[PDB]
From a paper:
Some intracellular bacteria have evolved deubiquitinase ([name]) effector proteins, which interfere with the host ubiquitin system and help the pathogen to evade xenophagy and lysosomal degradation. Here, we report that the opportunistic pathogen [name], which is unrelated to Legionella but has a similar lifestyle, encodes a similarly large number of DUBs, including M1- and K6-specific enzymes. [name] has one member of the [name] family ([name]), which is more similar to eukaryotic otubain proteins than to other [name] subfamilies. When testing the same protein (0.5 µM) on a panel of di-ubiquitin chains of different linkage types, complete cleavage of the M1-linked chains was observed after 10 min, while none of the other chain types showed any cleavage after 60 min.
To elucidate the structural basis for M1-specificity of [name], we determined the structure of the catalytically inactivated (C82A) fragment SnOTU1–255 in complex with linear di-ubiquitin at a resolution of 2.5 Å. The asymmetric unit contained an unexpected arrangement: Two [name] domains were bridged by two di-ubiquitin molecules, that is, each [name] domain was bound to the second moiety of one di-ubiquitin at its S1 (distal) recognition site, and to the first moiety of another di-ubiquitin at its S1’ (proximal) site. Overall, the arrangement resembles the immediate post-cleavage situation, with the two halves of the product still bound to the enzyme. The [name] domain of SnOTU1–255 is fully resolved from residues 2 to 242 and comprises the [name]-typical papain-fold domain and an additional N-terminal β-hairpin motif consisting of strands β1 and β2. In agreement with the [name] alignment, the active site is formed by Cys-82 and His-234. Indeed, the proximal ubiquitin is bound by an extensive surface with major contributions from the N-terminal β1/β2-hairpin motif; deletion of this region leads to complete inactivity. Tyr-13 and Phe-15 within the β1-strand and Tyr-20 located in strand β2 make hydrophobic interactions with the Ile-44 patch of the S1’-ubiquitin (Ile-44, His-68, Val-70). Contacts outside the β1/β2-hairpin also contribute to the S1’ recognition surface: Arg-230 and Lys-231 form salt bridges with Glu-18 and Glu-16 of S1’-ubiquitin, respectively, whereas Phe-25 interacts with Phe-4 of ubiquitin. By contrast, the salt bridge between [name] Glu-185 and Arg-42 of the S1-ubiquitin is crucial, as E185A is the only S1-recognition mutant that completely abrogates activity. [name] achieves M1-specificity by a particularly extensive recognition surface for the M1-linked ubiquitin at the S1′ position.
Author numbering:
A (entry chain B): 1 to 72, 75 to 152
B (entry chain D): 1 to 152
C (entry chain C): 3 to 242
D (entry chain A): 2 to 242
Write the structure that this text describes.
Amino acid sequence: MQIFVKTLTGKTITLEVEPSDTIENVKAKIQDKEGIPPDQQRLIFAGKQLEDGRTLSDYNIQKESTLHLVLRGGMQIFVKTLTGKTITLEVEPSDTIENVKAKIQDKEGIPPDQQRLIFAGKQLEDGRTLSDYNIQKESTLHLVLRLRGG
Amino acid sequence: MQIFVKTLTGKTITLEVEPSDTIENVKAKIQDKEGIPPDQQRLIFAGKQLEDGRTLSDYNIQKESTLHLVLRLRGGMQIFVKTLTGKTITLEVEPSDTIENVKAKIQDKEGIPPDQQRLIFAGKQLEDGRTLSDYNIQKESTLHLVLRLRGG
Amino acid sequence: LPVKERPDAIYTFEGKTYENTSFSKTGIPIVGQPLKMEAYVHKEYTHVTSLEGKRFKSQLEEAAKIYGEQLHEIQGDGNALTTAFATSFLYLLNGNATLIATFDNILIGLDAHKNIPPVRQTIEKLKVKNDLELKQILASNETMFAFSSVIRHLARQKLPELGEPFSLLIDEMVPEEDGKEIEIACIGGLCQLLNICADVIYLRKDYDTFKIERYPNETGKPDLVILRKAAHFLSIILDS
Amino acid sequence: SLPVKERPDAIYTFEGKTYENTSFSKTGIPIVGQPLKMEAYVHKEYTHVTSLEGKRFKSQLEEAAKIYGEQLHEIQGDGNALTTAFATSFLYLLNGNATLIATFDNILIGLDAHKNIPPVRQTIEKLKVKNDLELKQILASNETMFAFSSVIRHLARQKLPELGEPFSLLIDEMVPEEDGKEIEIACIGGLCQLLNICADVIYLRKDYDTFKIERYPNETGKPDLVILRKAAHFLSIILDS
């Protein structure tokens, strides 16, 4: 199916997609053609937001359908690497540690299962939330890579 | 971890793997280094066969472990898949293999995803969840492959 | 279908107005003008970064290396398979009186269809090789839509006569309703009926190289070259 | 311990045929291999490469050689490859560097008793004057390099906690005491901090077309060591000047 996407600047573009393509994959195609990074993309269709996990078929998107890029209150935190590199993330108090490691992956290319996160001298568990650790605005987390070998 | 693999000819090979790697992924590494197609590979470790879906950690495989490539079981059924153009594809299957598993083998030889394949036998389209025995597909039987790849 | 989903619809979302577009408003023709492949790649993959896009880009450039430097874009109205076929078929009909007569004889035998008369009038204009008339034919959205719908109707009526698999899967493979996608096997059947050869270029996102589906025999010189870019079809202008 | 059929060198029967597990001692793989051109290593490991993971590793290996050096040392995967690859790259830097030998020797004197400390000290003393031939003999001695590797592990466990977090908190998980237990990459960063040297660790990534360089202790600086991570295994790149 061939769909339409209208950018924030009003430009209209066509995309050759398939019903099974996920929304995350759509944003990747928008970047390949127009250059907008996926982290800046917020897509809507018929007045409903699209999450990276669904597919076009779920939102009954078909040929000639039009998706609109729109502007997005997120909490800013920092993740410092062993060498002192500072990573800036946008998070919510309900986000789990696994979600934060997924955000680190999108910026550093490191799989979540290869990351350790430390806050207040404590290692953070993947299933718990940021609120469980009292991680607030401007808090700084520490990233230590695993990547073990022998 | 660094493991050993011994081919049917006795040659010994090393592989740099990780505990989470699957057996299918190991066979892919064996092909990259030695060239044996994964469909010919039957791996054992400590006298136990290895299934394509499990991982090395499951078989408590670690550093210095040795995997052996062994001959396939006798008595397995050979079937043929003929495309719309007349090309003949040859597969090794068991009566318990599902139609989905057969399409996965077709993918490994033709590079076409299973969800883009139709299989027909006795003028009837075959369902993914049923087995070859459920359709009375015997040794040397011929199935027909019709590609989907729809577009508009 | 719901109002908010329809083309050209206007709605509001979080205090801002949005207007869905359409093929008629964007002016995208049924069959685009001749376009060099390198220009098409720059249009679709100017900022390519994803693995799927890099593979499509390199496979598109390899296809042009083999078959021809130019192509026709095809509107994704759901009939792109028959529209791309008609485009490639018209290049073959240009100046080929014997093939035009064989095609006209098939059209006469088909059940009634509103677009059959205009298609017959069109192929009459190509008995003598005329590149300029072909250009005007391909530039007419109404002419090419008629051609595209006639190929669909033709496939549904004649392919079942070839036997299996077409007798068993015709409705799933070539739906009657306009705008419903068609399976690739339809091209293979059409080549068999018309006694021509086609190469279909299956762009694969899971592999570094494309896959060539050649009909009716895995050997032979192609008369048509159709490219499948996801669930969409384009027509390559075959160079000699 | 572990079942008989799983042990190295074990012989068992499977479907009417006999099979013999191998081992590092039977295959003769040295602790540290001889200098090997990268193109020769790639030909060994990826001569029939077809998978996406292997083609990425192959292209990332060839780019690594373009940047850092044409030759490398293979390292035995006995579970100590991180400290063995570190020792290999470190010995190239110690060759002819009397100042660094003294700094390293001073750390060794302070470490808790260990049988392999005396031989390591005698070895580095033989490198105060640049001697490529002695270095070649050192790296070719399985006994010497195993001793060198185990001393680095012992050294890391004793001294890295003194750097503070994260090492004080994760030392046992990051650098196990038992020989043959894999070590996490942060151990290299700590060692560079203690020894006041710079290292580039080349993380070969199967999910990306390019590798990722982990540089310690600062994301800027000229590397003295170049260590390559190929899956859960480490090799040592011979640094060209």
